[PDB]
Design a protein around this ligand. Sequence first.
Ligand code: HEM
Ligand code: HEM
Ligand SMILES: Cc1cc(N)nc(CCc2cncc(CCCN(C)C)c2)c1
Ligand SMILES: Cc1cc(N)nc(CCc2cncc(CCCN(C)C)c2)c1
Ligand SMILES: C[C@H](O)[C@H](O)[C@H]1CNc2nc(N)[nH]c(=O)c2N1
Ligand SMILES: C[C@H](O)[C@H](O)[C@H]1CNc2nc(N)[nH]c(=O)c2N1
Ligand SMILES: [Zn+2]
Lengths: 407, 411
Amino acid sequence: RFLKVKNWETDVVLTDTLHLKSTLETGCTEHICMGSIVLPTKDQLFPLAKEFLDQYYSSIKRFGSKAHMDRLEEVNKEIESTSTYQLKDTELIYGAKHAWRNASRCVGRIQWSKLQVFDARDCTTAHGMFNYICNHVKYATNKGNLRSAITIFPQRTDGKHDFRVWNSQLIRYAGYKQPDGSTLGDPANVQFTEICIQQGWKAPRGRFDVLPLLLQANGNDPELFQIPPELVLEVPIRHPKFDWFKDLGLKWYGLPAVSNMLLEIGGLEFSACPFSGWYMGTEIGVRNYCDNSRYNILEEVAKKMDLDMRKTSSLWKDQALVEINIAVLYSFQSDKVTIVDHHSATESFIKHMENEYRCRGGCPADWVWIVPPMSGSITPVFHQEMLNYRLTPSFEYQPDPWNTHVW
Amino acid sequence: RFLKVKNWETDVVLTDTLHLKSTLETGCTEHICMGSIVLPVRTKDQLFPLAKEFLDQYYSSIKRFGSKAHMDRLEEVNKEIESTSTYQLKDTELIYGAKHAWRNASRCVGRIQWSKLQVFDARDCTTAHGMFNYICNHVKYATNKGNLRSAITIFPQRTDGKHDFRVWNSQLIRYAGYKQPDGSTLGDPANVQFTEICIQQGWKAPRGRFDVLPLLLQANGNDPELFQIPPELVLEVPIRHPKFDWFKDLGLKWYGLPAVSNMLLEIGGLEFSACPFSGWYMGTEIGVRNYCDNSRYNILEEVAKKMDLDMRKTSSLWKDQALVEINIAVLYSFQSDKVTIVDHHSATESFIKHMENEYRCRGGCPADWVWIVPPMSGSITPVFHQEMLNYRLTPSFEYQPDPWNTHVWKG
Ligand code: HEM
Ligand code: HEM
Ligand SMILES: Cc1cc(N)nc(CCc2cncc(CCCN(C)C)c2)c1
Ligand SMILES: Cc1cc(N)nc(CCc2cncc(CCCN(C)C)c2)c1
Ligand SMILES: C[C@H](O)[C@H](O)[C@H]1CNc2nc(N)[nH]c(=O)c2N1
Ligand SMILES: C[C@H](O)[C@H](O)[C@H]1CNc2nc(N)[nH]c(=O)c2N1
Ligand SMILES: [Zn+2]
């Protein structure tokens, strides 16, 4: 019941007491571990509110105080009367930050307390949502000096008035399937690109076309909006030693901004809560550029370096992968766009992890996601045993809107 | 029940039914996943059901389930258990058992080869000297002048737990590690503790960077004894780089035969506490872990210096860059000396094919993702994108505590 994690590089052991407060399920059982699986009413509501308020009021050193009791009382009344309740600004900010804090798959959580929170709960329309999102993008981008932020739109009511952002990220490149059989642009974004076109987007059918926003307010039909181009910061990709790299035509956007998750706080559900931080280098160089089901550019890069691609044992893929990733970090750094390499980030997480164990009694973490997709064992997290478990407030996955939406 | 795994690169979906035959625990609960945790004397009471479970499986595999031979064998084991409190496996059952433990080893990427396992029956062995001889033959046979053959040697099963056979070495062949008074380490830092024991047990350490450790062998619960593997039997490969001529001057080499000797083999409730096994190396085990772990030989700095990489910013990826060339050198070296080795690309792709075949023919293939994914270049190998289900089947290889923490010294 009091669990221990070992670092096999430093022999350091930590004791986890925090997991006892876990509520949601993992997917795993005593008979089977699903650690590598990507996706495993009023009576319901008040205990949820109370659990949340109890930790809010405990966090502000006023547990069991009049203001505490009063709030509980007050929220209990409002749930009884309204079948829901509204979070106070203070609670909203706490909840959002703690959702990030609890995100067991996120390596960048050392930053958790510095989340800029934008209360968009007064928003009523998609144009409204658009205005709020452009403001988010511009604030967070900050001319390349990125700042973490989240914008929170009205909470769910009866599930038929949901606010949803249909894009998976605020900024992503379109994907087009060619009559020639291949795929132009980002293959991960093909299906969404079709919905855009089906909703009226006129695609430029280029390779790096910034997608339009599909915004949905109050459970209404989603609307299309183009982000002001001058608000979308992009970085041309060059290599510091290889002159020819620039001719590969590669660029990436500076702002990673997840927009399809569900934020849960005290039983309330925020279905539209786009948040953003800044890139770890490998997300772009390893995953986005080198995944077979993405831009898949390894072969072309390798050819340009003139490597022996005859046998896998020349490790030409590995060589090219390093250089591709060198170029990304180099390109961003040269243009003063905030980026972090996988070494620096993982080292930060180990410090954060220790901090959490020391001050909170633990830190839920998913090793499968925390370990970077390249050079894993030369990063400290690889040798770090982690306990994975679900704490609330949380960001959750939710079904894509098109399967849900009654047009 | 039915469970589905998805490959996020190819969208191939597979269905696991085999996990239903899982008995043992994972360490996980509905409230906690322990998937990245490294480590999460028996009565006749529990023994026969375990025996029966195994024998039922064995007889099904040979298509004789419910036969008279099946029924007689269960009867025979039942009686041997009540008369003698244990039982002996037939040769056929031992071989089947040993292959299936490998097959069930959810952390092993090399399981495509599982049916091709050379089983050496050392159950007649009675002394440490006898163990030495058996192990020498294993090493020679498995090395095969560089054309490596998987083998396992099985010593007598546990009885009352006071007469265990144990190989005290974690691996048959390993390099000594010596802590210096200045805090530095000569040799393999992983093996410092064991080296000290060996020295204490009478080993004359030559104290170099690559000294092959003596065998420390325990027979029938007696004190362990030292033996030195004949040098001529220990195949080693000098490490050089195909393009970089200075790489040879780093003075590196490794041994060709990876051979785990500190694990426990469970077959039908029987415990084999001494069961060394060997296959051949995946390049990254040496090039990434053995050379590049900070707690091991830790050569990244010295290599990157010789390459003249920018070592001021970690964002130059100088560590990643040196790590690749080192792994290039390990593969090049082994191939050049005609010693069996496999690269992580080849090995993971082979595993994926193996895993799919197992779903089709067996209804599942338990796999530990954390261990299956190579320690470099993870997502450019197909396993990274493979959802896997981890569960425990028997026969199995289990961890057991180090013998020096348990052994009652006869003295
Ligand atoms: C500021 C620097 C940040 C860094 C370096 C960072 C890094 C990462 C990385 C590498 C991943 C793995 C995702 C992938 O490979 O696709 C991830 C996941 C995640 N991050 Fe962070 N992130 C940052 C900011 C944030 C912020 C501001 C939030 C929330 C307010 C957040 C919440 C999450 C969540 C919920 C996931 C899991 C997403 C999923 O499961 O699909 N991150 N992060
Ligand atoms: C023939 C070529 C083989 C290859 C390429 C291979 C590959 C590997 C690798 C890379 C590991 C991870 C080791 C580490 O990173 O610490 C591993 C683990 C393991 N292997 Fe294999 N293996 C082979 C043969 C065998 C054989 C013959 C057996 C048994 C008869 C076996 C049983 C196991 C077991 C039980 C583990 C888990 C070790 C642990 O839990 O500490 N392997 N294998
Ligand atoms: C805020 C933030 C910061 C950062 N450095 N990276 C991210 C990336 C998060 C992210 C990007 N693409 C995709 C996913 C999820 C893909 C897999 N889903 C289906 C589980 C998540 C987000
Ligand atoms: C038969 C075999 C073949 C092969 N290619 N590799 C191996 C390596 C197995 C191996 C080697 N060192 C260390 C470990 C992990 C040890 C267990 N934990 C507790 C440190 C595992 C074994
Ligand atoms: C199948 C496996 O779970 C899948 O490839 C996961 C592995 N780890 C990951 N880790 C991160 N950070 N991001 C990912 O998308 C994935 N994908
Ligand atoms: C804590 C973590 O599980 C530990 O460092 C593991 C990670 N995955 C591994 N995978 C392999 N093949 N070998 C290892 O030693 C480890 N170590
Ligand atoms: Zn688990």
